[PDB]
Structures are given as C-alpha cells and as structure tokens.
Amino acid sequence: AFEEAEKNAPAIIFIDELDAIAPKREKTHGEVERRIVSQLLTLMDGLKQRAHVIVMAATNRPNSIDPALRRFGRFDREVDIGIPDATGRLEILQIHTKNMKLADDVDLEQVANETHGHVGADLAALCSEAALQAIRKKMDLIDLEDETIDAEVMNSLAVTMDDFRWALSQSNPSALRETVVEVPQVTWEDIGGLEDVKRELQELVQYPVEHPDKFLKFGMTPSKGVLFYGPPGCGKTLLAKAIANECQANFISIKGPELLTMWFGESEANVREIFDKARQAAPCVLFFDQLDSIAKARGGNIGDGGGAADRVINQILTEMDGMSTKKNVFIIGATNRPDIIDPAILRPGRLDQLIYIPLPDEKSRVAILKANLRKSPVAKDVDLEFLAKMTNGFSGADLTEICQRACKLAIRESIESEIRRERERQPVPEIRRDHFEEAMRFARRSVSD
Amino acid sequence: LSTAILKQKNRPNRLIVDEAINEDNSVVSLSQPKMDELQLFRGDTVLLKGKKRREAVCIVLSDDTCSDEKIRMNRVVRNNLRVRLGDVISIQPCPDVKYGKRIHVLPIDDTVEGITGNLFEVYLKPYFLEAYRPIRKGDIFLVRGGMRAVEFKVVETDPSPYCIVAPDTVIHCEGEPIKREDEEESLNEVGYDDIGGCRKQLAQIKEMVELPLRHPALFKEIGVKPPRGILLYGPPGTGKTLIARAVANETGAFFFLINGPEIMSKLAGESESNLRKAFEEAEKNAPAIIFIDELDAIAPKREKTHGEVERRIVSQLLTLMDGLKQRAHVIVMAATNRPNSIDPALRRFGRFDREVDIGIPDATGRLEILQIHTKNMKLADDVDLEQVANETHGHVGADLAALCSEAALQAIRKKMDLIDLEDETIDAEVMNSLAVTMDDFRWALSQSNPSALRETVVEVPQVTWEDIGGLEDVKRELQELVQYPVEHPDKFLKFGMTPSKGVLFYGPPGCGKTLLAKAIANECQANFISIKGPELLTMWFGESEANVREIFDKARQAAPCVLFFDQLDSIAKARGGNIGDGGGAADRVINQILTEMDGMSTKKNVFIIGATNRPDIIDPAILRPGRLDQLIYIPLPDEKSRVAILKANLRKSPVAKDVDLEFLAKMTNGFSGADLTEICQRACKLAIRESIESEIRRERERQPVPEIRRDHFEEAMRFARRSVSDNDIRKYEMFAQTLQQSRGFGSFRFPS
Amino acid sequence: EIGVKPPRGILLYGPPGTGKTLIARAVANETGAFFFLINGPEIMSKLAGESESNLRKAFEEAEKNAPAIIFIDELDAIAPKREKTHGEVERRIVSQLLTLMDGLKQRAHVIVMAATNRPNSIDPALRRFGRFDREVDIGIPDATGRLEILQIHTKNMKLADDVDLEQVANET
Numbered sequence A: 001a002f003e004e005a006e007k008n009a010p011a012i013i014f015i016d017e018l019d020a021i022a023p024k025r026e027k028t029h030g031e032v033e034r035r036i037v038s039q040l041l042t043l044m045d046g047l048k049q050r051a052h053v054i055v056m057a058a059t060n061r062p063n064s065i066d067p068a069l070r071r072f073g074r075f076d077r078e079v080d081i082g083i084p085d086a087t088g089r090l091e092i093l094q095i096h097t098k099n100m101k102l103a104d105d106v107d108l109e110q111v112a113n114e115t116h117g118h119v120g121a122d123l124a125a126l127c128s129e130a131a132l133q134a135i136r137k138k139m140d141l142i143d144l145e146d147e148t149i150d151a152e153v154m155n156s157l158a159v160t161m162d163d164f165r166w167a168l169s170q171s172n173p174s175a176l177r178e179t180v181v182e183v184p185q186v187t188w189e190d191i192g193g194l195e196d197v198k199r200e201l202q203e204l205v206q207y208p209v210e211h212p213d214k215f216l217k218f219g220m221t222p223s224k225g226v227l228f229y230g231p232p233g234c235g236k237t238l239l240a241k242a243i244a245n246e247c248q249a250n251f252i253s254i255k256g257p258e259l260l261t262m263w264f265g266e267s268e269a270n271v272r273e274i275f276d277k278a279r280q281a282a283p284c285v286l287f288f289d290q291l292d293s294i295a296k297a298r299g300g301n302i303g304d305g306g307g308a309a310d311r312v313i314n315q316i317l318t319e320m321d322g323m324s325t326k327k328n329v330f331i332i333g334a335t336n337r338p339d340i341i342d343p344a345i346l347r348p349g350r351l352d353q354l355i356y357i358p359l360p361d362e363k364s365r366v367a368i369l370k371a372n373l374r375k376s377p378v379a380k381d382v383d384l385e386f387l388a389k390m391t392n393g394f395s396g397a398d399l400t401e402i403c404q405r406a407c408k409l410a411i412r413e414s415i416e417s418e419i420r421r422e423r424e425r426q427p428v429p430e431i432r433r434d435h436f437e438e439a440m441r442f443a444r445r446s447v448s449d
Numbered sequence B: 001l002s003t004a005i006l007k008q009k010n011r012p013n014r015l016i017v018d019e020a021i022n023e024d025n026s027v028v029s030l031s032q033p034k035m036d037e038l039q040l041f042r043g044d045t046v047l048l049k050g051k052k053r054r055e056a057v058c059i060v061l062s063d064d065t066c067s068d069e070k071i072r073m074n075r076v077v078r079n080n081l082r083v084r085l086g087d088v089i090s091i092q093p094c095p096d097v098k099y100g101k102r103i104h105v106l107p108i109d110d111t112v113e114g115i116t117g118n119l120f121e122v123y124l125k126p127y128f129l130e131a132y133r134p135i136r137k138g139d140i141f142l143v144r145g146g147m148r149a150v151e152f153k154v155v156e157t158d159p160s161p162y163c164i165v166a167p168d169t170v171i172h173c174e175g176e177p178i179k180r181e182d183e184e185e186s187l188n189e190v191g192y193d194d195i196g197g198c199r200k201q202l203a204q205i206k207e208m209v210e211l212p213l214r215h216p217a218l219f220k221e222i223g224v225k226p227p228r229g230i231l232l233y234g235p236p237g238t239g240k241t242l243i244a245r246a247v248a249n250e251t252g253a254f255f256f257l258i259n260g261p262e263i264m265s266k267l268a269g270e271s272e273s274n275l276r277k278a279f280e281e282a283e284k285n286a287p288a289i290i291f292i293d294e295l296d297a298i299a300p301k302r303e304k305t306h307g308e309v310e311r312r313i314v315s316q317l318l319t320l321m322d323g324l325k326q327r328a329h330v331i332v333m334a335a336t337n338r339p340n341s342i343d344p345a346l347r348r349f350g351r352f353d354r355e356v357d358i359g360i361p362d363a364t365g366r367l368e369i370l371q372i373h374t375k376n377m378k379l380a381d382d383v384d385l386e387q388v389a390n391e392t393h394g395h396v397g398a399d400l401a402a403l404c405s406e407a408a409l410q411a412i413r414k415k416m417d418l419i420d421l422e423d424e425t426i427d428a429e430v431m432n433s434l435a436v437t438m439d440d441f442r443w444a445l446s447q448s449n450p451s452a453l454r455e456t457v458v459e460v461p462q463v464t465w466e467d468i469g470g471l472e473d474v475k476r477e478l479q480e481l482v483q484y485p486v487e488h489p490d491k492f493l494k495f496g497m498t499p500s501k502g503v504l505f506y507g508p509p510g511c512g513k514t515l516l517a518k519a520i521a522n523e524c525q526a527n528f529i530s531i532k533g534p535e536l537l538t539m540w541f542g543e544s545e546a547n548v549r550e551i552f553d554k555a556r557q558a559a560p561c562v563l564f565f566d567q568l569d570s571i572a573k574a575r576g577g578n579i580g581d582g583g584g585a586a587d588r589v590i591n592q593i594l595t596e597m598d599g600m601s602t603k604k605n606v607f608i609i610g611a612t613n614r615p616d617i618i619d620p621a622i623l624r625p626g627r628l629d630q631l632i633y634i635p636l637p638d639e640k641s642r643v644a645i646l647k648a649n650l651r652k653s654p655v656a657k658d659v660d661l662e663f664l665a666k667m668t669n670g671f672s673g674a675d676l677t678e679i680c681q682r683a684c685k686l687a688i689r690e691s692i693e694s695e696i697r698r699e700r701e702r703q704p705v706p707e708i709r710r711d712h713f714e715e716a717m718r719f720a721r722r723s724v725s726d727n728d729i730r731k732y733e734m735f736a737q738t739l740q741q742s743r744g745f746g747s748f749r750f751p752s
Numbered sequence C: 001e002i003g004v005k006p007p008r009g010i011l012l013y014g015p016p017g018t019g020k021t022l023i024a025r026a027v028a029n030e031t032g033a034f035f036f037l038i039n040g041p042e043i044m045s046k047l048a049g050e051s052e053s054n055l056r057k058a059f060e061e062a063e064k065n066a067p068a069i070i071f072i073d074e075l076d077a078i079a080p081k082r083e084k085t086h087g088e089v090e091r092r093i094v095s096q097l098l099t100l101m102d103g104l105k106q107r108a109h110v111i112v113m114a115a116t117n118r119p120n121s122i123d124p125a126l127r128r129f130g131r132f133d134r135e136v137d138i139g140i141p142d143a144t145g146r147l148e149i150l151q152i153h154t155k156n157m158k159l160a161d162d163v164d165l166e167q168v169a170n171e172t
C-alpha cells in the first residue's frame, strides 16, 4: 500500500478504523499484531522522507491508539471533530434538505434549536423518520398491496412541520441510546411547593447554555454540581424526573451500584465511559441516584474487602476535575444519608451547590394535595386545608398514599355495588369525605423526628 | 398511521375465498354483479394473488350462489395459493396469456405408491386432453382415478410462468417424484399472519422491508434513503427468529442468513473474509436482506473484548455497514437477546438505525397468539381461548406453544387404553375420536410455567385460604391488592391513580406471615418469586447488586408478579452500621433495592411483599410509602382467632366430638398459632403411640384408636408452652404504638 | 393427526448417581434411531472456530440420518450462562448451540437429550421451550424404588436363600 502511494504522487493514504490495525503494543498478546504496529511506526518514519504522500487516519477511540503513534513526527497534527453547535446543526439541516420536498411552513432554525446532542447522523435519522411519517399520512389513499400509485398522491408528497415535530418527539442521540430509561411523564406543576428549588434548577440548567457571555463578562465560572439531601419521600427523584421530561438538556439517569464489576479495572472503565458519553452529548445532566452507594467515607473499603470502592471514587473525582468549564455537563446527586458521603466530593469545585429538600410545610402540603388530585374527580365538599392542618409531619409520599388509599376505598365500593347489581340481575362518581377519613385513619408518618 | 400499512382498507378487488361446489381444479366462479364491476367476461383467464408469493391462474366462471364479496374456489387452488377459507385475495386478468408449448409435471411420491398403471396414461393423458386449463409453476392439482388419486405438480411451464394446456402440448411424467415431506414443508411456511401480538412492531418491520421494495418511487419522490438496518431485541421466546422466517418466506428480495458463531474460522483473517464474502454476495443480487442471528455473539464491545480476532471482526462489520463505499440497496437485520452487549458504534444511524423491541405480549396479544396456534390444531366445542389467554400471565409465545403441545400430549395420553405401542398401526375410529378438549387445556395450565421463571421456581406446600385461621381483614386486603390492578385497571384509570404495590408483614414469630405468603403463592392470579434473604449475596465485588437487579428484572418480565422476601431484615438493614461487610457490600445492596423499588424507571405491575421478625432494624428508606406502602402487623391471635386456628388445623384430622375447642382456645392465652399447631401435633403423636402399643399387644396375643380423644389433648396440653414472651410482645406493641402516635389521631373527622 | 409437533428436547437433572447416563444408554439401545454421543468437554479445542465446527458437524451428522437422538452428557460444562462467562469461546459455543437447536432452519426429526447435575448453570435461553422442551427430574429412589433397583442388580449374581432384599432396602 505504501509503495503504491509512493509510485503515484502526490497521494493520500486513508486508514479507516486505525485502532483496529494499531492497538497498544503492551496490551497486544499476538506476535503478528505487534509486528504490524511496529511496521506502521516504521512506515511513518519512512513517510517522513517521502515528499508528496500524506497519511490521514480516522478512529472512534483516540485513546486506544498506541501512544507512540501519537508522538511527534508520526501523526503530528490531530483534529478533534467535535459535536456541532446550534449553527452547525442548522447548516447540516440545510445541506441535507436541499433535495427533499420541504413545504413552505417548515423553518430549519427551530429544528436546529430543538436538538441538543445530535452529531449529524442523528439529524439524518430525523429527516428520514419525518419523510417516513409523511409517507404514512398518504397510506390511507394508497395501499402497499397496490402495484401502482396515482400521480396526484405523488404530487401530494411533501414534508410539513408536523412531520419534523413527530420526528423530534421520536428522536434521540445515538450516544444516549446505550443508556435510556422510560421516565414517567412528570411536569413542574405536578410537584407541589419547592418553588424556590424549581426556579434555582431552571436557572442553573438554562443560564450557562443560554447566556455564557454574562458569566465570562463577570469572570465567574458557573457551578456544575448540585447535591440533593433530605428526608425520604420529599421529592429529589421527582425533581430529577421533572428535569428529564421538561428541561431541554440531555439526561443520563443511573443507579448507584450499577457501575461496579468484579473484574479488575472494569468499574473505573465504566465510570470513564459514562462521563465520556456525558461529554459527547453536552448540554447533558448526569444524575446520580443514591449517591451514598458510590461515594462513601474513604479507607473503609481498603480496611475490609477488595478496596475497589476507593479507586472508583478516586476515578470519579478525577473525571469531575477533568471536564472543562466551557463544556455543559451538570452533575446532580441525590441522597437521603448525606452524612456518609465522602467530603472530597463536596469540596469546592465539585458538587458546589447543596440544596436541602425540606419536609413540606402547610402551604407545601396544600400544593401537594392539589397536585395529586388534579386528574381525579373529587367532591367539592372535600377540604384540603384541613388535611394539610392535621398532617403536621407528613412527607409528600405519605400524602400521596393517603390519596391512594382513598382511591382504593372508592374502587372497592364501586366493585361491591357492581356485584350487588349483577347478583340481583341474575354509584361513586367521585371520592367522598368518607374515603379520605378512612384513609387518614390508616395514615402514619414515614419520617421520625 | 403506524398501523396503516397493516390495514387492507377494504379494496374492492380482494374477495372472500369460498368453497366451490362444482368448480374443477383450474376454474373459479364469481357472482354476476362482481364481474359487472370487474368487467370480467365468462371463460376469461385471470391471475389470482396469494400468500407467501404464491400465484395461480384459473378460468373465471359465473355462479349464482357465489356472493358479491366472495369467490368460490376448489381446494386445489387454495393449496396452490396457500390460502385458507375466508382469506381475501385480489383477482386480475392475466395479461398476454399464451398457450403452453410444453409442460412438465411430476407426481407426488406417496400417491405413485401402489399405482400399477402408468401415471401419464391413467391420469395425465385423459385429464390434459382438450382440458384448456391454465396452470402456473408450483401448482398441485388432484387427479381422480385408480386405486388412489394421484396429485400432479407442474414443475416447469413453457412459456414461464403462464401457459395453457393444449392437446398438442407435450405431457410427460418423467423425473423423480415430488416428495410428500417437501410439499408439506412448502405448505407450512410462516407469513406475516403467523406472527401474533406486536402489531406495531410488525408494521414497522413491514415499513422497513416491504415498502421500499414495493414502491421505491415514493422514496425517490420524497428524496430520502429508507432505513437499511433493523435490530430486533427482546427476551427469549418472543418471536424475533419467527419474524425473520416470515420475512425470508414472503419477500421478493434475496435473503442471506448469517448465524453468529458460524463466521469464525481457524485461519487468520478468514472470519473477516467470510463476512466480506457474505456482503459481496448480497450486493451481487442487488435488493437483498441479510439476517445476522445471534448478533451479540460476533459484535461485542471493542473496549471489553480482549481478543484481537474478535475486535478485528467487529471493526470489519463496522466498515462493511458504513464506509467509503456505501451499501447498494441491501437491508441488514439482526436479532439479539442482549442489546446492550452490542458495540455502540453499530447502534448508530448509519448501521443499525431502527431498533424494534419485541416485547412480552399483553392478554389480548397472547389470545391472538393462541388463535394463530390453534387454528391448525383439532379443537372441541368446549375449548374457550379467552380463559386460557387470561390465565397465562407472563407467557411470551414460546410458552404458549409449550402449553398447546402439553394439552395435545395429554389428549393423546387419554387414549392409551385403546392405542398400543406394540401394534404397528392405530384404528381410524380412535383418530376421529381424538381431539383436544378443555380439560386437556386445564391440565396444561396446571403444569404450565413461564420459561423466564424456570430458575426461580420452588415447590410450595399447597396452602389454601381456608387453612389460615383468623386474619380475615388481612386476607381480604391481600386479595384486593393482587386482584384490583389486574382485573380492574379501568377503574384506576377513571380515578386516575396508580395502585400501591408494597406490603410488609411484621409480628411475633409463628403468627402467620409465611403462611399468608404460601396462600398467595398457591391461589392468587399472579406469578410468584420467593427469595430467602441472604440468598442474593455473593463474595465477588459488585455481584450482589447484579443478583438483585437480575431478580427485579425477572419480576418485571413476568408481570403481574409477586416478589416475596422471607426475611427482609437480613438484606435491608440500616445503612452505615457495618464495620466489615466487605467494602460496604450490604449498604450497596440496600441502595440497589432502594433504587429498584422506587427510582427513575416507570412503575410496572410488580408487588413486593416482605416479612420480618424485627422491623426496627430495617432501613427507614425501605419503609417509605412507594416502597412497601402498607405495613401490616400480624399480632398474636385472640380468642376467636384461636378457635379458628384450632378448627383449621383439625379439619382433616378425625377428632372426637367430646373435644371442646372453645375451652382450649380460652385456656391458651398468648399462644401463637405455631403453639396451637404443636398442641394438635402432640395429641396426634400420643394417639399414634397408643395405636402402636395396641397393635403390639394384639401381635403378642396372637403368637383401637379410631379418632383422637380428650385424654390425648390433656397430655398434649400439659406438655404445652408459650413460645413468645411478654418482652417480645411489648417491643412489637412499641413499634405499633410509635406508628399510631405518628398518625396523630386515632380518628379523623372533617368539619361540618 | 392431532396437529402439533412432538416434543424434541429433554433435560435430565438430578444428584450424581441417580441413573441419568443409564437412562441414556437404555434409550440408545432400545430405540431404532441413530444415536450420537457428545461429551461436554470433548467438543472444545484451542483453535478459534473449531469447537463450533465440532458442534456443527455433530448436528449435521444427526440431520443426515433420521430419526436421530443426540445426547450431550455434562451439558453444564459446555453451556454456561453468557452473562457470567468472560471468555469469548464459551459464549460463542453457547450461541452456536442455541442456533443449532432452534434457528431459522429447524431440525425436522432430531431429538436432543442432555444430562446435567446442576440445571441452573444452563443458559436461560436453552431452557426455553424450543430448545429443551421439558426437564425430567431423576430423583433419589424411595424405599420401594431402591428395592426394585436391588432386585434388578441382584438377578445376575448368585444369591443364597437367606438373603432378604426387603430388609436390605429398608436399611439403606
């Protein structure tokens, strides 16, 4: 290959999947592959004396390339083809959609603004999905079993803005495809109270991406860490769900102990790759549920057991320091046992902001009771103010289970009435005060003082 | 929209296939109004559409009996078209129909057995003499005569594929007979109809594969490239390979099959060569479909893989699917059980852009699967498939097939008295009498169990709700808990509230918690997974949480499922109090459970039940509503409950009438249920001892106790003791009192 | 006539010594079907792609002669869980077995029998209906069962009159 490159000059050599042919020599366990890596190094050295031949390589994994290949004189210039920003996404959309039969109503700038982490292949996926939806709209008139299509239907073919809206609802970045979970539909008015915390979260998620200019003007680097700590059942995971559904920033939701693996070094590799795929999709929100599972007080693991927990937390602190300020990755940690958390992760620069989710107050309890019953037919005689008054120490989960007990009693009564009517053959339009009274009789406080 | 591709839209041409009273193999009869709509004259040649890329040509006729929406057809044409009665087929005139220059026909191997006369002379020569019968390749027509009627199949038609039989046309029976097994296999080819459930998934598959080949003009007009890659992922037995067979059987494109490990070869660089040859062969035939079965075998993560050959194969696949040279009209499909094991680079838009999730069917889905499976089987009138669909809770479709096979096997078993293994043949009367009945399906349902739960299955001592005494409110509450979200979901939707899905039983030892669990496991209509507390824990790092996650995943797959933790305080304890425990492995397990019961993932229909002797040490976060919503206290029985317990233990045992259970219940105060059972068992033992001594005395004399009496109970009572002391009672009552005082009021009344 | 395909998979599990291989031998000698024996570890080889080839040739030879019975003794050695195993050759041999038992091309008349001491080590996909139709449990014999075993064993040997196999069955 290098000979044929030399014979015909000037020439370009393209090596696709470089990490496939050139892994680390010390990692490789095969003689032939080590010989091949050495051959590549020698051929770069020979290329140095070559006049008109330039080699270009592409790799998904920059790290897997042998560090000697990254040394000066061999692949001297490295170009990082990062994810596009909003203007770049608009340019890609305009280039792709030159041949397509776009309608007049569609404007590409909105579509560019909507997408966050798409890398240019996801945009093509979005365009194809929208075209497929447009074709689906015409499949009532024309059937698949049919052999020919009328020319009028063919002229009817066009992509509207409804199609791009459908595709944007369906779309998802390829990197996040590995780690996606079905999150229940939760909106900001579903959460009762905590208005200050809602506004703070909206600010901290929206300001650095929307207006970095103010932060650079005042010389303040924005805080990229939040810690949620409070009693059980107060709404940390609920706020995470709301941020996932509503906010326009990618969400990576992870349980705590899911990173850990018995093999040596796998847990650190998982931490590195999760932070990596968080960077690739910025602006992204990385939510650590049950943070005390991973970050515990150092030295206990070394004292008893393998001790890999200490190396995991060291790796997490390293990756937290590594990410740049300009990059939009916001890290949220939720915990209901804040005391066992390693103080190193609370040190300034990492999880700077600490938000305490308090046990709800009277107005908070009123808001919670209103929010829970918004979708349920409830009699006007039901007084939520009295329920908030009586439940002084109840948390949000307790109020929810009170309402669920009322609903279950209503269901039971309806089933009894239905069985009575069926038996005589061979009621409850809404939850009343009786159901709430019985549910309150079954109520109990989840969190002690 | 999504299901629009599946709908037939009631096009006028499609007509209901109907039995033809007098039509022959090569003619069809239609109503006069339909022909007037179709402008089809009598005796005209038409082309008939069929399933699985099957077509045949027949002479249209006029029939008065035939309906407007129906077409009267012979069994021969249905066999040619692979269409059952009632299927809709389009009828169109054959264009440029020509007389057959020469036709070659081959009879079936089974029929030619026992035919002394020549097949051509006895059958072919008179039938094809002035027949003027249009035929097509692959058509099998039955010919009468001889000792057995011989089916004849025209393998070759000149001109292909449409021709007219003429007397001057040459007919010959030369050649190997057509194998009966081959014809049966051609009959049993699955299509899109054999797939049950997952209508949206089937629609998406058809949009990916069927639509571009049928109508490339649509995509060219809209100017986009249709998706080229499909990944089918789901738990085993849901039907990914069945969809692959359906696509292979009824598509016009070239189908090339790659099985995962089959690529590997001993020589260096031979696996990459195998992949390249496969893709090159697909590209040679232009519109092609490549199905890579068991993709996770040959596409692991490149970071995780330690072998150079495997990583080189993955990179070869990546460059084949996307590179400098793009595929020219080649569709690539893959089916994997473990979608996450695939390398992330393959899951990009270029290569595997559409991932179609074949999931566990719901009740209507498995009813549809059952109808598809049993349309071929012989069934009686008493069999009701709605019941069988409602009972089978977590079955995926392979399990429903297992249920059908078990019912058929039982039906055959019922006739072992008549049938003989030694005899070489069986009577035809028995064959007529043999049919699957509802009792066979009931027995199969008794045996049946989901394949996912085969590993976590345990024999249960077969308790029933009547064996438990007392605890009536707890019984009714558990029955409501399991039954309401399953049998009455529309009520919850109307009230717009999700059910509570957690219960904790705590109380003194021997009071009836594991007994309630056994009753639920035996009776209720929900799958049961039973977990001993410390069974999940493992010495390896990170493995314990893996076991917890796997068990919760199994519970989610087989929903509605009940998950029972026999000793919850072993696995869920207050965090941070363990000096050793590895590297806080117990705390990590507790965190994993906390995340699984209530986390980001949407709630499914899984009920967690836990039992504990010491509810104080259990982590406070576990007891929060949303995880173990309802705490139920199983107290020491009072007098009425003690009467009920004594009656429930003694219902099978023959006891004398003079025994007064009310007096026993009155005297025994503070006795747990286990204590009363021990009293009954001791009385039984004393009776057995008395019987043994009487028998020994009788045997000695040669060379009693029909029922348990009051003296045995008196001895058993003098041996009796109280198992649970007053300190234990006090501490349980203290936990209950803490909860009651936390309530803030025994009674709550709204103001007037 | 009944309209279903007969079951084509069997798994025999039980503690060591119960008689799984004895049942395999009895079925092999008593049936008019081509019997092929596969031992678990006998399949695997150092070279890449040779163990899968051994499985393919075994199933191909079974396909050529019909009806056939394949007995994979110590299946737990050849088919561990793909989640747990780290080595690639084990995962690929499990996948090859899966695709051979039930794939796009289905075995028409091959019946696969397998004996394993520990059934839970088997890959959960193999325990599915299509692959291993049902699992037969060869358990510890009862008193009457062990008396029958004693009578079968002792018919060949010479036995004096005083021997009482009833009591010998009672004591064990």
Ligand SMILES: Nc1ncnc2c1ncn2[C@@H]1O[C@H](COP(=O)(O)OP(=O)(O)OP(=O)(O)O)[C@@H](O)[C@H]1O
Residues within 6 Å of the ligand: A190, A191, A192, A193, A231, A232, A233, A234, A235, A236, A237, A238, A239, A334, A335, A336, A368, A371, A395, A396, A397, A400, B598, B621, B624, B626
């Ligand atoms: N402020 C609130 N408004 C509405 N619902 C609430 C509120 N607080 C709690 N809930 C209800 O309780 C649950 C929220 O619990 P969540 O998962 O947010 O708690 P958490 O703070 O993460 O606690 P844990 O320590 O138990 O994990 C939901 O079922 C929700 O309906």
Ligand SMILES: Nc1ncnc2c1ncn2[C@@H]1O[C@H](COP(=O)(O)OP(=O)(O)OP(=O)(O)O)[C@@H](O)[C@H]1O
Residues within 6 Å of the ligand: B194, B195, B196, B197, B235, B236, B237, B238, B239, B240, B241, B242, B243, B335, B337, B369, B372, B396, B397, B398, B401, C098, C102, C103, C125, C128, C130
């Ligand atoms: N939707 C369905 N309708 C009818 N039968 C079905 C359906 N899905 C599966 N089956 C039955 O299950 C078997 C096909 O299962 P299949 O081979 O497709 O599973 P799979 O998803 O490939 O599993 P594995 O993970 O083991 O590869 C056949 O017996 C078929 O009758």
Ligand SMILES: Nc1ncnc2c1ncn2[C@@H]1O[C@H](COP(=O)(O)OP(=O)(O)OP(=O)(O)O)[C@@H](O)[C@H]1O
Residues within 6 Å of the ligand: B467, B468, B469, B470, B471, B508, B509, B510, B511, B512, B513, B514, B515, B516, B611, B613, B645, B648, B649, B672, B673, B674, B677
């Ligand atoms: N209410 C009851 N009715 C009938 N039998 C009962 C009752 N309560 C206990 N028993 C008897 O108790 C025995 C089993 O006790 P069980 O398994 O219910 O105890 P447990 O509460 O789970 O205790 P442990 O603390 O030991 O786990 C059986 O013999 C059963 O008959």
Ligand SMILES: Nc1ncnc2c1ncn2[C@@H]1O[C@H](COP(=O)(O)OP(=O)(O)OP(=O)(O)O)[C@@H](O)[C@H]1O
Residues within 6 Å of the ligand: C015, C016, C017, C018, C019, C020, C021, C022, C023, C115, C117, C149, C152
């Ligand atoms: N049911 C039985 N009836 C008669 N003899 C038996 C029976 N079970 C076992 N044996 C005797 O015990 C011997 C050992 O049994 P066998 O080789 O079948 O064990 P196994 O269960 O297959 O063991 P492994 O764990 O090694 O696979 C047999 O050769 C036979 O002599």
Ligand SMILES: [Mg+2]
Residues within 6 Å of the ligand: A236, A237, A289, A334, B598, B599
């Ligand atoms: Mg939470």
Ligand SMILES: [Mg+2]
Residues within 6 Å of the ligand: B240, B241, B293, B294, B335, C102, C103
């Ligand atoms: Mg499969």
Ligand SMILES: [Mg+2]
Residues within 6 Å of the ligand: B513, B514, B566, B611
């Ligand atoms: Mg118990």
Ligand SMILES: [Mg+2]
Residues within 6 Å of the ligand: C020, C021, C073, C074, C115
């Ligand atoms: Mg053996």
